[PDB]
Design an enzyme around this catalytic site. Structure first.
Site, PDB file in Angstrom:
ATOM      1  N   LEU A  37      24.002 -25.984 -51.484  1.00  0.00           N
ATOM      2  CA  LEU A  37      25.539 -25.410 -51.294  1.00  0.00           C
ATOM      3  C   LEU A  37      26.454 -26.956 -50.524  1.00  0.00           C
ATOM      4  O   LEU A  37      27.046 -26.343 -50.342  1.00  0.00           O
ATOM      5  CB  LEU A  37      25.346 -24.273 -50.159  1.00  0.00           C
ATOM      6  CG  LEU A  37      23.853 -23.238 -51.494  1.00  0.00           C
ATOM      7  CD1 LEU A  37      23.910 -21.776 -50.993  1.00  0.00           C
ATOM      8  CD2 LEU A  37      24.899 -23.026 -53.133  1.00  0.00           C
ATOM      9  N   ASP A 153      33.451 -20.610 -33.089  1.00  0.00           N
ATOM     10  CA  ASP A 153      34.500 -21.513 -34.325  1.00  0.00           C
ATOM     11  C   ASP A 153      34.310 -20.503 -35.541  1.00  0.00           C
ATOM     12  O   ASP A 153      34.030 -20.585 -36.373  1.00  0.00           O
ATOM     13  CB  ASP A 153      32.597 -22.718 -34.631  1.00  0.00           C
ATOM     14  CG  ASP A 153      33.722 -23.618 -34.534  1.00  0.00           C
ATOM     15  OD1 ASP A 153      34.553 -24.014 -35.257  1.00  0.00           O
ATOM     16  OD2 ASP A 153      33.150 -24.361 -36.082  1.00  0.00           O
TER      17      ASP A 153
HETATM   18  C1  LIG Z   1      21.225 -21.201 -44.637  1.00  0.00           C
HETATM   19  C2  LIG Z   1      22.487 -20.236 -43.525  1.00  0.00           C
HETATM   20  C3  LIG Z   1      21.845 -20.313 -42.535  1.00  0.00           C
HETATM   21  C4  LIG Z   1      22.293 -20.220 -41.209  1.00  0.00           C
HETATM   22  C5  LIG Z   1      23.676 -19.493 -41.492  1.00  0.00           C
HETATM   23  O1  LIG Z   1      24.536 -19.190 -40.280  1.00  0.00           O
HETATM   24  C6  LIG Z   1      24.268 -19.842 -42.234  1.00  0.00           C
HETATM   25  C7  LIG Z   1      25.613 -19.756 -43.098  1.00  0.00           C
HETATM   26  C8  LIG Z   1      24.033 -20.624 -43.489  1.00  0.00           C
HETATM   27  C9  LIG Z   1      24.614 -20.349 -45.055  1.00  0.00           C
HETATM   28  C10 LIG Z   1      25.050 -21.378 -45.335  1.00  0.00           C
HETATM   29  C11 LIG Z   1      26.312 -21.641 -46.106  1.00  0.00           C
HETATM   30  C12 LIG Z   1      27.129 -23.099 -46.281  1.00  0.00           C
HETATM   31  C13 LIG Z   1      28.029 -24.041 -47.398  1.00  0.00           C
HETATM   32  C14 LIG Z   1      27.878 -24.998 -47.346  1.00  0.00           C
HETATM   33  N1  LIG Z   1      28.780 -25.651 -46.159  1.00  0.00           N
HETATM   34  C15 LIG Z   1      28.097 -24.733 -44.889  1.00  0.00           C
HETATM   35  N2  LIG Z   1      28.908 -25.625 -43.715  1.00  0.00           N
HETATM   36  C16 LIG Z   1      29.747 -26.142 -43.553  1.00  0.00           C
HETATM   37  C17 LIG Z   1      29.825 -26.456 -42.003  1.00  0.00           C
HETATM   38  C18 LIG Z   1      28.786 -25.859 -41.408  1.00  0.00           C
HETATM   39  N3  LIG Z   1      30.192 -25.164 -40.345  1.00  0.00           N
HETATM   40  C19 LIG Z   1      28.979 -24.227 -42.549  1.00  0.00           C
HETATM   41  C20 LIG Z   1      27.119 -24.023 -44.653  1.00  0.00           C
HETATM   42  C21 LIG Z   1      25.709 -21.481 -47.180  1.00  0.00           C
HETATM   43  C22 LIG Z   1      25.269 -19.787 -47.522  1.00  0.00           C
HETATM   44  C23 LIG Z   1      25.729 -18.698 -48.228  1.00  0.00           C
HETATM   45  N4  LIG Z   1      26.440 -19.667 -49.268  1.00  0.00           N
HETATM   46  O2  LIG Z   1      24.413 -18.214 -48.823  1.00  0.00           O
HETATM   47  C24 LIG Z   1      24.457 -19.942 -45.946  1.00  0.00           C
HETATM   48  N5  LIG Z   1      23.419 -18.780 -45.941  1.00  0.00           N
END
Ligand SMILES: Cc1ccc(O)c(C)c1-c1cc(-c2ccnc(N3CC[C@@H](N)C3)c2)cc(C(N)=O)c1N
Length: 278
Positions: A37, A153
């Site tokens: 992702l 953020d």
């Molecule tokens: C796994 C996880 C663990 C803790 C957490 O807090 C979060 C949000 C996640 C999480 C992150 C992402 C995701 C995909 C692509 N880019 C980014 N990022 C770009 C930079 C940064 N800031 C954020 C995040 C997708 C999902 C989802 N689709 O289920 C998700 N559950």
């Protein structure tokens, strides 16, 4: 030899189908990797299916092993912050976290595309959808603030599309508690003006959500500095950004973008407006 995976929690690892006797990691044994992702210096996020319960989740893993005890402490701190957020329908829910081989893993519920991705693969969104995103992320901020927490953020990339027009706020690595604790640099495009002076509080999130929603509603890049950055922080909406925005949305955004944080509307005050009912 490698130490067994350890659960990471600040409150107080074995699972069906995980065999410590077998060489490969808990992540390799306990999940089926379905797609990637996201990837960056922060590591990688995968869509997975869990062997334990057969359900879909997302797992974020760090990119490189801990360099020292402080690096480890700072990375694990994200889990403590995320645990403080807990369960809320408008916040990305942490299922469990663990460390293995110097790598930190966070397993959460699986969410849809970020608002950033959703915008990129739409132009400008129908305003009915924008109102939904605003309302859901306001509910998230009221929840955070109740826990004495501030997200430093809030931005399109950190809001994820859930079921049926719903939004969930995530990435609690830059959450601070009302001392503060260590924190990284939030995106300057969405930063509340008082943060220049290191001042923060529950109002800073509201301001960032205002520019987040402004950006997704008008589909234009916000300035990261210079005169354009200052002129978004004066208490009015520059016409450049308001083409096609309804009078109703404009008025709520200007409440959120008040430069004086003592005057700025609270999440709960915004949620009490007739326009945001239900
Ligand atoms: C796994 C996880 C663990 C803790 C957490 O807090 C979060 C949000 C996640 C999480 C992150 C992402 C995701 C995909 C692509 N880019 C980014 N990022 C770009 C930079 C940064 N800031 C954020 C995040 C997708 C999902 C989802 N689709 O289920 C998700 N559950």
């Amino acid at each position: 030899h490698q130490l067994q995976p350890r659960r990471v929690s600040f409150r107080g690892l074995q699972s069906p189908g995980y065999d410590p006797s077998r060489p490969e990691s808990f992540f390799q044994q306990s999940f089926q990797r379905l797609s990637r992702l996201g990837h960056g210096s922060y590591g990688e996020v995968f869509k997975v299916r869990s062997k334990e319960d057969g359900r879909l989740y997302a797992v974020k893993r760090s990119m490189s092993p801990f360099r020292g005890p402080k690096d480890r402490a700072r990375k694990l701190a994200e889990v403590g912050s995320h645990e403080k957020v807990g369960q809320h329908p408008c916040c990305v829910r942490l299922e469990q976290a663990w460390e293995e081989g110097g790598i930190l893993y966070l397993q959460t519920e699986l969410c849809g595309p970020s608002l950033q991705q959703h915008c990129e693969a739409w132009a400008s969104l129908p305003e009915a959808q924008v109102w939904g995103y605003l309302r859901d992320t306001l509910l998230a901020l009221a929840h955070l603030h109740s826990q004495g927490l501030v997200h430093l953020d809030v931005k399109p990339a950190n809001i994820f599309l859930g079921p049926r027009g719903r939004c969930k706020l995530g990435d609690f690595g830059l959450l601070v508690e009302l001392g503060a604790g260590e924190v990284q640099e939030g995106d300057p495009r969405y930063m509340a003006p008082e943060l220049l002076q290191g001042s923060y509080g529950t109002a800073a999130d509201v301001f960032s959500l205002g520019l987040t929603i402004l950006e997704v509603a008008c589909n234009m890049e916000l300035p990261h500095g210079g005169e354009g950055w200052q002129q978004l922080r004066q208490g009015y909406l520059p016409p450049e950004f308001t083409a096609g925005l309804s009078s109703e949305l404009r008025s709520v955004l200007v409440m959120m973008l008040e430069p004086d944080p003592k005057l700025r509307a609270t999440a709960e005050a915004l949620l009490a407006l007739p326009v945001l009912r239900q």
